[PDB]
Amino acid sequence: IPRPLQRLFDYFPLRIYEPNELPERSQQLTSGDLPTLYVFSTDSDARLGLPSFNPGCLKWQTLLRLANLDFRILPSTNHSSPTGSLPFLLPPRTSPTASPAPIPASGLLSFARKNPWLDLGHLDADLPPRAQAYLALITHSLRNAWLCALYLDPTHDALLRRLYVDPASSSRAVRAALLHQLRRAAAEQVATASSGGGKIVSLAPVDSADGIDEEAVYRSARDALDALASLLRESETAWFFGTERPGSFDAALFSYTHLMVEYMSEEEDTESAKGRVSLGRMVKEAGNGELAEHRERMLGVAWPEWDGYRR
Amino acid sequence: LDEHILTPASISTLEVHGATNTRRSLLDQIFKPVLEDTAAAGTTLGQVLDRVGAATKKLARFDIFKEEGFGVFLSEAAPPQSAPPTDRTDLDISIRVKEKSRLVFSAGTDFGNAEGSAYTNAVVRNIFGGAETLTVNASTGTRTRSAYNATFSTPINGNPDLRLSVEALRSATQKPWASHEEHLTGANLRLAWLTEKGDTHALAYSSVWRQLTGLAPTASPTVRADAGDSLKSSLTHTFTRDRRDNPMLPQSGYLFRSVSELAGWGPLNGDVSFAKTEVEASGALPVAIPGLAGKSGVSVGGGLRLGVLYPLPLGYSLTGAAQPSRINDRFQLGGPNDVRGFKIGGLGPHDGVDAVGGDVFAAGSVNALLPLPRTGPDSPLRLQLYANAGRLVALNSKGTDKEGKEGLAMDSAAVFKGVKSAVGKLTNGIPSLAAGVGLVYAHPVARFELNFSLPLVLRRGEEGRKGLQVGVGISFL
Amino acid sequence: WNWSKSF
Amino acid sequence: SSAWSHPQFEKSAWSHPQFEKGGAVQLHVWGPAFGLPSIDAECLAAIAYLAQTLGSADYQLIQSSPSAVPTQHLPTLYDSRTSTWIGGFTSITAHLHTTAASATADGTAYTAFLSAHAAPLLALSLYVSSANYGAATRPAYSAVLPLPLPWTEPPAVRAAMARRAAHLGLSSLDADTPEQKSRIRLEEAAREVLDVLAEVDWAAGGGGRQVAAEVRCLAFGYLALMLLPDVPRPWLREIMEGRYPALCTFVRDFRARVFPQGGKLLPWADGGAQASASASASASAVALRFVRAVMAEVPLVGEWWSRWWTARKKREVLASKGAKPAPSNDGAGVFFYRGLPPFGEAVQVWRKPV
Ligand SMILES: CC(C)[C@@H](C)/C=C/[C@@H](C)[C@H]1CC[C@H]2C3=CC=C4C[C@@H](O)CC[C@]4(C)[C@H]3CC[C@]12C
Ligand SMILES: CC(C)[C@@H](C)/C=C/[C@@H](C)[C@H]1CC[C@H]2C3=CC=C4C[C@@H](O)CC[C@]4(C)[C@H]3CC[C@]12C
Ligand SMILES: CC(C)[C@@H](C)/C=C/[C@@H](C)[C@H]1CC[C@H]2C3=CC=C4C[C@@H](O)CC[C@]4(C)[C@H]3CC[C@]12C
Ligand SMILES: CC(C)[C@@H](C)/C=C/[C@@H](C)[C@H]1CC[C@H]2C3=CC=C4C[C@@H](O)CC[C@]4(C)[C@H]3CC[C@]12C
Ligand SMILES: CC(C)[C@@H](C)/C=C/[C@@H](C)[C@H]1CC[C@H]2C3=CC=C4C[C@@H](O)CC[C@]4(C)[C@H]3CC[C@]12C
Ligand SMILES: CC(C)[C@@H](C)/C=C/[C@@H](C)[C@H]1CC[C@H]2C3=CC=C4C[C@@H](O)CC[C@]4(C)[C@H]3CC[C@]12C
Ligand SMILES: CC(C)[C@@H](C)/C=C/[C@@H](C)[C@H]1CC[C@H]2C3=CC=C4C[C@@H](O)CC[C@]4(C)[C@H]3CC[C@]12C
Ligand SMILES: CC(C)[C@@H](C)/C=C/[C@@H](C)[C@H]1CC[C@H]2C3=CC=C4C[C@@H](O)CC[C@]4(C)[C@H]3CC[C@]12C
Ligand SMILES: CC(C)[C@@H](C)/C=C/[C@@H](C)[C@H]1CC[C@H]2C3=CC=C4C[C@@H](O)CC[C@]4(C)[C@H]3CC[C@]12C
Ligand SMILES: CC(C)[C@@H](C)/C=C/[C@@H](C)[C@H]1CC[C@H]2C3=CC=C4C[C@@H](O)CC[C@]4(C)[C@H]3CC[C@]12C
Ligand SMILES: CC(C)[C@@H](C)/C=C\[C@@H](C)[C@H]1CC[C@H]2C3=CC=C4C[C@@H](O)CC[C@]4(C)[C@H]3CC[C@]12C
Ligand SMILES: CC(C)[C@@H](C)/C=C\[C@@H](C)[C@H]1CC[C@H]2C3=CC=C4C[C@@H](O)CC[C@]4(C)[C@H]3CC[C@]12C
After folding, report:
1. Of 3.40.50, 1.20.120, 1.10.10, 3.10.20, which CATH number belongs to B3-96?
2. Residue D97: which H helix or E strand, with range?
3. How far apart are CA B275 and CA A108, in angstroms?
4. Taking the alpha carbons of A238, A240, A242, A248 in that order, is the dihedral positive or negative?
5. Neighbors of chain D by Cβ distance (3+ pairs < 8 Å)
6. Does D349 reach chain B within 8 Å, measured CB to CB?
7. First to last CA, chain A
8. CA D135 to CA D150: how far, in whole Å?
9. Are B106 and C4 within 8 A, CB to CB?
């Protein structure tokens, strides 16, 4: 029955017009000639392409700048990510109503190799077995310190509110709800850590700062930075393992050392009222100061035009 | 029996039986107008039976009493009267009513839809003796979050036609046409009012936290850019003049609806600010034929729906920078209900495969209902021939000269110029047009249609459906 | 199943 | 809400008091299993650390469960010399602590690596795989707890370990062509971790990489629970025995040297592993532990119960540590639908006024 009538269905529609134009909001945001990387940043930061304030997003933003990819960054949120978590890259529209598929975080480096503006093997080289052990310091020891000090410290409540929840909405009721979810999720991840966590109350995971041991997280970070400073001192060059160019390991460490110095180098936590050295102070005091100048050198390579990055 | 209604009459007393929970003061409001209009003139049963005939569904609109409990025992008054105008001038009337169940609790599960789908319902009615109601709904399952609901409804000052409702809401809505889902959380305050002429008014205040999550892998850049949180605090007015003889399958009469919504402007506060209005005019017209007197069953209908979404600045100033609209608020058009013959949301701008909304739209319909041969026109199932047109456009700042590229907001003159251009786009070019033939069923819980549609004029990127299409619902164009 | 305890 | 912030102190990284050799300390660990002093990887490492750095009479081992200690975490050390509670292996070693810089950095690196990645691998073998749980480890957990507890604690342990190994992406059916791809992912994930560990000279016989004895004890804790436990799915034991003979030799020599004869020679409290738990196996104490464990599963109240209970325990540990934690904050229902009469009578009547 469909076969004889196919000579009739193919006739319609009788008139086909040009597509309707996209809304104004879509035209302003999604139209661009350069691939756009969506990260956690502010509208003023995104204008100059300055480093994002999220260490997970800053890791990939640094590598893409080392990969010599020409791109622009835009503020975004995890809800828009194809993998449910930032960052991700949208290549520019081929036509005003069509766009290629988004590039997740894992496929960013493959995208950069296809769009030279060259051998990018150093940015995704397989680390030596010893280097795998040290990478656990960055991904676990330093990450847990970042999460505990940012989300769970009342001292950084103003900063956390300004960075993450204030741009989300202007409603105080919605802001309070979003802030609680952020702290619940952050406390859950730190609770999984062996040092500052490992406590089990019931089947549900621990999701409060009460299940987190602040000293165990803080002490592990202080030990991690001293260890990383020792590893960097071993190399005869300015980068880890003697490489002549920064690699995936350097970008991974830089994503934490930069933000710790930027946002937590204040003299209020280091004051006797708290009795603990701030994260940004430990970064500059680690070893003889290798991690401080490594952060300076990494900025001089990926952001040569930028200045005023101390705090 | 009709000669009993032509005689003079004068009612003496009335009694209501079984209203133990409802306060008598509430009962007074319906019966005092009955009580005041008594012994007015002869043949008053012509007046009396209709005015109590008004009362029966007046009490039914309270929803307190079971629909079956309306036993009327009107009779001639037993005691005599001094020189009465007629032997049956005096009457005795008593009404029997049984109240509905005070509390209703419901729960269950349905593994056919989801592996852990379960729902819980509880209804409490006629609290405090004044027809206050309270309904609580809770739903869970798998691959979904918990959904709650709690509505408290009450008549105002004993008037059944003026009902105030307070609702607390938490739900998630799937939106496959835009490759995302919307999480809702907020409260609504409604004041529904029914005019003496039958017109329905409704003034509602809403404050809902919208959140676009769960983007499908095919989500377009437009959907991704609009993901995230948004608080909409809006005040909306709904008007409805329904004169259709059968609202579920109109053969005669007309319908008019207006839905005006103001969000974010002035005292309202939130992440959005606009003034959205919709107008839906419909009508039908029976046509007679020489071959059969009386009700022929054939009729010709029509329809016309309009809508404008105007961005507004926040604060108390009419002149100022206005943010462009978001995918949550933009109109959606197309489908078996809105514009027959297209994919659900198949009209308007499309980003890849996602149907992103528009700011200005205008849909229309022309249809004719016919009865099948060897079947009476009183049958609820009929043949339908229809032709649907629609347009859905989006506001653009192409007409502006220059604006700061950092800012996303548009000045007041820019928005006005954009709206004028958007409305002008409706009147040029043939609208997206579809036509077809189908069968319509008017079974009074929902209208059922089995349509064979065939798109005629279409904009590139719009999705038509050339095959059979089934649409079930209470609202049709 | 779908229970209903109305009273 | 004050439940998601660093605790306030009466007027955050308060250091623990320095330990001095001589004071009696008590280590609360899980019970013996699989012929090992303990069943948990961290607890077994802590036992080995004490057996090498402290004399046989300077410490005691107490078989316990997380509900029996204020830290809600095992292993935990009770330094009776100052009555402080220290939870976690790293915190215990730091408390008891008295190219070196390259060696010190390596010890820190592998300590984080073992916790970060060797732990999920261990959880996958013993907890995520339902075949090994129902036949090898769940009997072991129940054998070291008082009667009503094995229905509350071991289920809670599995949930933690399942979350711990969740980042691997594998689940229970992979413990077993769909079978072949599951098997190769088992060997791939194990090789991704065991390759790093094979870099270090754990036996400390010379060459390789030299690390402090603190992390060598930790290495044994994770490796011993991966090799020795006889489970119905010995795939992880098979990989280590064949591909990595050096790790197999290290575990066997370490066990024979540090835990000769099943490890029963350790100074368990009250002269035995089971007798040690008797101090907290009283009927009243066990009942409270079970009841508190039950309350946490209430769908709405239970979640807030554990958050309040954990905060209370957090203050107790901090108070013992010499800190000064700030104090924390803590009919009409019968008058309706009952008691009051119905608002009207069954009969209401009106008549024409005079
Ligand atoms: C019966 C009347 C009142 C109305 C409602 C019906 C209109 C339909 C059935 C018919 C009437 C005129 C037709 C019409 C006129 C001219 C053209 C131009 C041609 O290139 C494409 C088809 C198109 C656009 C067709 C489409 C179908 C139309 C619009
Ligand atoms: C558009 C929304 C946002 C809000 C601001 C608008 C409210 C107006 C338009 C509504 C609110 C109350 C309404 C109202 C109240 C009562 C009556 C009496 C009736 O016999 C005629 C209509 C009339 C006069 C209607 C007309 C429409 C009114 C005035
Ligand atoms: C097809 C749609 C648009 C339906 C709703 C049509 C509506 C219009 C044509 C109807 C709706 C109300 C009607 C209407 C209301 C009241 C009166 C007053 C009377 O003294 C003259 C006719 C007049 C003026 C009629 C004319 C026809 C009107 C305006
Ligand atoms: C004149 C009055 C007093 C009485 C006799 C009848 C009025 C009706 C029949 C008239 C009054 C206004 C008329 C009317 C107004 C406007 C339009 C819009 C047009 O697009 C379709 C016809 C339509 C809908 C017509 C139909 C016929 C109507 C509704
Ligand atoms: C209810 C009676 C008393 C009167 C007032 C109502 C008249 C309305 C409802 C009727 C009268 C004339 C009708 C009318 C005339 C002509 C057409 C053109 C047709 O293509 C679409 C329907 C349409 C537009 C219908 C709609 C319904 C109308 C407007
Ligand atoms: C050479 C000129 C005179 C030709 C091209 C113009 C014809 C005009 C009269 C036609 C062309 C397109 C038509 C048109 C397009 C779309 C719609 C939307 C529909 O909901 C109402 C009618 C409306 C607004 C009609 C009205 C009549 C228009 C404007
Ligand atoms: C929420 C549920 C699980 C609660 C109320 C039920 C508890 C009962 C069924 C459980 C709790 C503790 C259990 C209990 C504790 C200890 C012993 C000693 C043993 O030699 C015989 C069985 C016996 C006596 C069991 C029997 C079952 C008991 C009494
Ligand atoms: C019959 C006696 C001699 C002994 C052997 C029997 C003990 C059983 C029946 C008792 C002991 C502990 C009890 C028990 C412990 C804890 C819970 C968790 C709760 O969320 C569901 C019930 C459940 C699972 C109950 C069920 C009944 C159990 C399993
Ligand atoms: C007479 C003796 C042999 C009885 C009392 C035994 C007591 C001991 C074994 C303790 C151990 C665990 C306790 C126990 C566990 C849990 C609960 C659930 C609670 O909701 C009621 C009490 C109940 C059931 C208590 C009762 C006393 C028990 C069963
Ligand atoms: C003496 C007893 C009968 C009294 C204290 C009852 C307590 C209730 C509130 C407790 C007892 C057992 C508990 C219970 C047992 C097992 C489970 C399965 C789990 O997946 C969801 C929670 C659930 C369903 C919890 C909910 C709370 C219950 C039902
Ligand atoms: C004779 C020429 C000039 C015609 C056929 C060409 C174009 C225009 C004017 C025609 C083509 C399709 C027509 C058309 C299609 C369908 C409808 C829907 C109906 O509810 C209102 C009229 C409306 C909107 C008419 C109006 C006139 C249109 C738009
Ligand atoms: C510079 C000025 C003179 C330019 C921009 C023109 C108009 C200004 C004043 C704007 C400010 C508020 C606007 C305004 C408010 C609300 C609505 C309701 C909507 O349903 C139709 C448009 C309408 C009526 C628009 C029209 C344009 C207005 C009146």
Report:
1. 3.10.20
2. none
3. 42
4. negative
5. A, B
6. yes
7. 74
8. 15
9. yes
